[PDB]
Each structure stands twice: as C-alpha cells, then as structure tokens.
C-alpha cells in the first residue's frame, strides 16, 4: 500500500553524464557512444544573451575549445556540429556505460524522470509531466542545463527532454534530444511566457483509481455521467477534454477496481463542483495530475527494470 | 527556481540489489563486499506467520537453501547467520560494484531515499522521512522487503533503512542495517499499530524558507514570537516542540533570507491558527514536513554527488 511521487531508477542515466565547458560556462552533457549532446547555449557569451548568433559563435570554435570531462577524465573532442538547439561533440572514446537507448519526443500529459545535474554530477532525481502548455514544473538552478528527462521501458532508456530555459513563474522549457524545443520557446533571453496551463484530466482520473486501490474511497458517489456532460464540467474548471482514447487507456484500472470510467467521471465532477471540504485523497488536499494511467499501474503492480 | 520532492541518485544502490529466495518466498537482498543482507522473514512459512520461531527455522537451513541471484548470475552462499531481524548470507564473490558505504541509524525527522525493488530489480526511487512515530510513509507491495533507504554524502552511501512490514493505515516499518527495528515493531504478524504521529516542525519551517527563496512570500507577517509562545501553539496543532538545536540548524536558511527563525515562527503560528484560505505554498495546499533544512539547502544550492 501507499502511493508516492516515484521516479525511475537513475543509474543508467548517471553513467552518461559529463560536463561541457566553454570559457567560463559549464553545463552538463549526455555521453552516448562517442557523441556528447549538450545545449548549444554553452557557447554563449555574457555580451550576446538577448539574441545569440549561434552559427557565428560555433564557426569561431575549434574542437579544443570544448573541455569535456567525465568524472576526473578529460574526453578529447574530435568533431562538433549543431543540430537545432543542441551541440553534438564527437569524442575519441565511446562511453562504455552507454545503455540501450532511444530518442523520443513525448506528448503533453506524459510523465518522465529528471536527473538534475551540476558540473556533470547528479544532484537528485524527480518525476515531472510535460504540461499541456509544453512547460515542466522542474527544480533547476544555474548550471543545470543539459540535465535530461527520461523513461525506462525494460532495459531501454528513452531520453525525451534536455533542459535549456527557465520561464517566468519558475517553470521550465527544453528540447527533445534532436534539439527541437517543446512548445513555442527559443533559446535566447527574450520575452517568452507559457500559454495558460490546463489540468491533465486523464491523469487525475488515474490518480483517483490509485486512491481506490489504496482504500481511500470516500469521494465515490452513486452516479454516472455521459462523456459529453463530463467534458462540459471539465471545461469550466480548466481541465482538458477527456477523449475516448483516454477512456480506453484507463481500461486496466477500471477493470481492476470494477469502477466504470464514466462512473469515476461522475465522482470527479462532484469533486470539481463541490471541493473536498478539507478532506484529502492519498494525503493530498489538491487533485493530482502528474501520474499517468501507466504510472499508477507500474507503482501499484510493482513493475521493475 | 522550483522545488520538488527530490530523491538521491540511485545508481550506487542499484548495483547492490540482489534477490534472495527460500522455497517460494523471494525478497530483496543488499550485496556489499561478500555479504548479502536481507530480512530474516524470508525463511518464514505460510504456517508460522503469527509468531515465527526464527532460530529453529534458520537451524534447519543449509547454505544451499538460499538461492541468491544478482541479475542473471547465481551467487553461491558459503555461510549464513542471523543478526537481530536480518540475515547475513556470506557469498563466495565480493560485489565489484560495492560503493563506499556506512551503516547508520537515523533519528525521527530525518529524511532518506528509498529504492523500491522486486525480485532484486528496482521499480522506482522516492524520498521519505522517519516519522516521529518511527514509521515511514512509503509505497511497498508484496515482495518489496529488503528494499533499502539511504542518504549520499559525497561518494559515500549511508544505508539507514531496510523494509520489513506494512502497518495498519498503509504505513511502513523496518530496521537499520544491523536488523534493529525503528520503533516498537516486531517482524511477526501480530497486532501492531503506530503511536500517534506528529508534524516535524523544524522541517515545516525549512520548507517555508524554501518558499521564500522561490519568491512565494505571501504568508510572511509583520510579527515575531518567543520560542516558548510558539511551542504552546505548536503543541495544540500536534506539531513537535521546536528546540534551540532546531533553531540553530535553520541558521543557514535564516541567514540567506534575512528572516529570523523566530520571525518565521510567527508566520507559521498564523498559518496554523488561521489556515491558508485556499492559497498554496510551493504548489501545496498543506504544510509540508518531509524536507529537512539540509534537504532545502542541497536542492536550492545544487549540491551534487
Ligand atoms: C532564466 C533566464 C531569465 C536566465 C533565461 N530565461 C529566459 O530568457 C526566458 F525563458 F524567460 F525567456 C534562461 O533560462 N536562460 C538564458 C539563456 C540561458 C538560459 C539559462 O539560464 N539556462 C540555465 C541552464 N544552465 C537554466 C536556468 C537557470 C535558472 N534556472 C534555470 O532553469 S537563453 C540562451 C542565452 S542565455
Ligand atoms: C502487511 C501484513 C499484514 C502482511 C504484515 N503486517 C503486520 O503483520 C503488521 F505490521 F501490521 F503487524 C507484514 O507486513 N508482514 C507479515 C510478515 C511479513 C511482512 C510483509 O508482508 N512484508 C513485506 C515484505 N516483502 C512488505 C509488505 C507487503 C505489503 N506491503 C508491505 O510493505 S511479518 C513476518 C512474518 S509474515
């Protein structure tokens, strides 16, 4: 029993973390085979933060200008190129700890773990969601860029996120591992703000199912609802529309608990309209939306890697 | 910016996890040098759960009766003994991935990361606190026992917890790595219940300091308080007494923010007496008490390992 915001084991990613330095700027890099991937703003100068000329900045660099260190070992850079907003530094040594891996581009609503790093060394690991507005609610300081987000399937690490930016109100923006930003963000210091965020409805429902599995059942009412009538209420409280794909994705949890998805929707409708009246669900006074249906099953069934 | 329930990187502990099997019972073990540590109730039978005769059960075991596997590799057991509530299985191979480590017994209020494992493989990592009533609010299923809790200092893993039991209301009990339970719990199936829990006051204050560091400042009032008058209010709301050692431990955060500890105490007093009125602090509608002062500094200053 119990339900926790649980991250993936980070060991496979820890063995890929390095530091990249240009001048006085040090960030993290990700070392896979004989390539180090890092944010291209490592080559920025204090002068030209507002709108860096990345191509000119990179042209003026030689391989020797990139100081790449893995632990206490310097890795010699033998080539370099820019792919969208990331640098690819070819090094003369393949990472012997390279896991089986994939580069993936996740969808809003999906979750992943972040290994927060400084100077190529890990600080901690936590679980995030790609918000509907393509930000993430992370915890990042100066020097954290190049930290990555990931999922693990079995033995395979799917890298989905590399950190680049902090946006107003303390939320975070970054790219996939091909250097393409999630959302309408750019890697320069310019007026940027996320669109209005929304609550990930299918995830709230998955978390309510987790509550039921854990015996926290007080919010279950006697009613049902149509999908359309539910979504009319969801819209008012800034919840995303629930789709039939979402309903089908909740199938395993609905089957395990014997609660039809639309019946859970009726209970969620009542929570939205009436509040929780000082009660908690799984220890929280707010409805949680950063657990996917798959996260709930993984945690409640003990899936390992 | 940002503040997350952040766990330690788990790689060093992942390389120590094995599975131990007796009959049809498989749990996790921790492999350090040439010893595997695991919960002794691995040798239990379905018959004698209410009050197992551990010494008789172990006498009847030979080394060959313990099936210890590291990944897909069987480790041959060459000796075995019982230390309080843990077994020590001597194996013929020293773990080549053994980190620098220490066995420590933590105090209530302190925090650690748990690497939840099944069949010797990790499922996920999360951050816990040793509650004042010597339970932890974990997430554990059948087969999770032998999972361990830990802190990392620099390169050194301090193991502090190994999981044994789930108590009524879905909270968890276990031992240090010398097999001594935290709290008044025993490893048998008998009526056990935790004493009343309390809120870890020094941790709530540390988390309020984290809020201020992140610019979430609305709860700061214009008042101050004496330590004694604060503790009279704390007692009413089931908060632990704040000691002078706690005040001094908050020194770094008080210095960074320029807010005296007793001034923060006045703001916390007002929160306890008046509630939050639907507002949140660092995204939470409840006051959080599972971040220590050291956790806050680590996360807000980017300490690495
Ligand atoms: C938050 C800022 C105001 C400084 C800025 N943000 C924006 O300009 C906004 F998005 F608001 F438009 C921003 O993030 N920058 C500015 C550049 C680098 C990058 C950056 O510091 N990235 C860090 C890494 N390493 C991680 C940051 C540091 C704080 N916490 C994080 O997560 S962009 C390329 C030229 S300098
Ligand atoms: C929860 C129980 C009612 C089953 C029981 N608890 C109690 O008896 C109480 F504490 F309430 F008094 C308990 O935990 N037991 C019974 C024994 C083993 C141990 C146990 O199953 N430990 C698991 C491991 N592996 C981890 C558990 C499984 C569920 N989630 C967990 O965390 S004690 C030694 C003889 S059988």
From Swiss-Prot, chains A, B:
Residues 1-305 form the Peptidase C30 domain. There is a cross-link at residues 5, 90 (Glycyl lysine isopeptide (Lys-Gly) (interchain with G-Cter in ubiquitin)). Residues 1-305 are cytoplasmic. Changing residue 145 to A: Complete loss of 3C-like proteinase nsp5 cleavage. It is found in: Host cytoplasm; Host Golgi apparatus; Host nucleus. Changing residue 189 to A: Does not affect ability to cleave and inactivate human TRMT1. Changing residue 132 to H: In strain: Omicron/BA.1, Omicron/BA.2, Omicron/BA.2.12.1, Omicron/BA.2.75, Omicron/BA.4, Omicron/BA.5, Omicron/BQ.1.1, Omicron/XBB.1.5, Omicron/EG.5.1. Inhibited by pyridone-containing alpha-ketoamides compounds 13a and 13b. In turn, alpha-ketoamide 13b (tert-butyl (1-((S)-1-(((S)-4-(benzylamino)-3,4-dioxo-1-((S)-2-oxopyrrolidin-3-yl)butan-2-yl)amino)-3-cyclopropyl-1-oxopropan-2-yl)-2-oxo-1,2-dihydropyridin-3-yl)carbamate) inhibits SARS-CoV-2 replication in human lung cells. Inhibited ex vivo by michael acceptor inhibitor N3. Inhibited ex vivo by compound 11a and 11b. The chain holds residues 3264 to 3568 of 4405 of the full protein. The active site is at 41 (for 3cl-pro activity), 145 (for 3cl-pro activity). This is 3C-like proteinase nsp5. It comes from the Viruses. It catalyses: TSAVLQ-|-SGFRK-NH2 and SGVTFQ-|-GKFKK the two peptides corresponding to the two self-cleavage sites of the SARS 3C-like proteinase are the two most reactive peptide substrates. The enzyme exhibits a strong preference for substrates containing Gln at P1 position and Leu at P2 position. 3CL-PRO exists as monomer and homodimer. Only the homodimer shows catalytic activity. Interacts with host FBXO22; this interaction promotes the proteasomal degradation of nsp5. Cleaves the C-terminus of replicase polyprotein at 11 sites. Recognizes substrates containing the core sequence [ILMVF]-Q-|-[SGACN]. Cleaves and inactivates human TRMT1, preventing tRNA guanine(26)-dimethylation of tRNAs. May cleave human NLRP1 in lung epithelial cells, thereby activating the NLRP1 inflammasome pathway. May cleave human GSDMD, triggering alternative GSDME-mediated epithelial cell death upon activation of the NLRP1 inflammasome, which may enhance the release interleukins 1B, 6, 16 and 18. Also able to bind an ADP-ribose-1''-phosphate (ADRP). It comes from Severe acute respiratory syndrome coronavirus 2 (2019-nCoV).
């Amino acid at each position: 029993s119990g339900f926790r915001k649980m991250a993936f084991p980070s060991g496979k990613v820890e063995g890929c973390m390095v530091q990249v330095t240009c001048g006085t700027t040090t960030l993290n890099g990700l070392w896979l085979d004989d390539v180090v991937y890092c944010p291209r703003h490592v080559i920025c100068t204090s002068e030209d933060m507002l709108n860096p000329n990345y191509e000119d900045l990179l042209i003026r660099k030689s391989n020797h200008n990139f100081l790449v260190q893995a632990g206490n070992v310097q890795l010699r850079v033998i080539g370099h190129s820019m792919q969208n907003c990331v640098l690819k530094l070819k090094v003369d040594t393949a990472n012997p700890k390279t896991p089986k891996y994939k580069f993936v581009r996740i969808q809003p609503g999906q979750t992943f773990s972040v290994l927060a790093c400084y100077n190529g060394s890990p600080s901690g690991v936590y679980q995030c969601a790609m918000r509907p507005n393509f930000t993430i609610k992370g915890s990042f300081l100066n020097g954290s860029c190049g930290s990555v987000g990931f999922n693990i399937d079995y033995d395979c690490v799917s890298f989905c996120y590399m950190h680049h930016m902090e946006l107003p109100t303390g939320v975070h923006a970054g790219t996939d591992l091909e250097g393409n930003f999630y959302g309408p963000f750019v890697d320069r210091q310019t007026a940027q703000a996320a669109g209005t965020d929304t609550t990930i409805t299918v995830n709230v429902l998955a978390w309510l199912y987790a509550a039921v599995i854990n015996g926290d059942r007080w919010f279950l009412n006697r009613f049902t609802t149509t999908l359309n009538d539910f979504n009319l209420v969801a819209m008012k409280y800034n919840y995303e529309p629930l789709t039939q794909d979402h309903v089908d994705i909740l199938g395993p949890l609905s089957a395990q608990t014997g609660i039809a998805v639309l019946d859970m929707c009726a209970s969620l409708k009542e929570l939205l309209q009436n509040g929780m009246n000082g009660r908690t669900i799984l220890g929280s006074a707010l409805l949680e939306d950063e657990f996917t249906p798959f996260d709930v099953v993984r945690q409640c069934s003990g899936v390992t890697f």
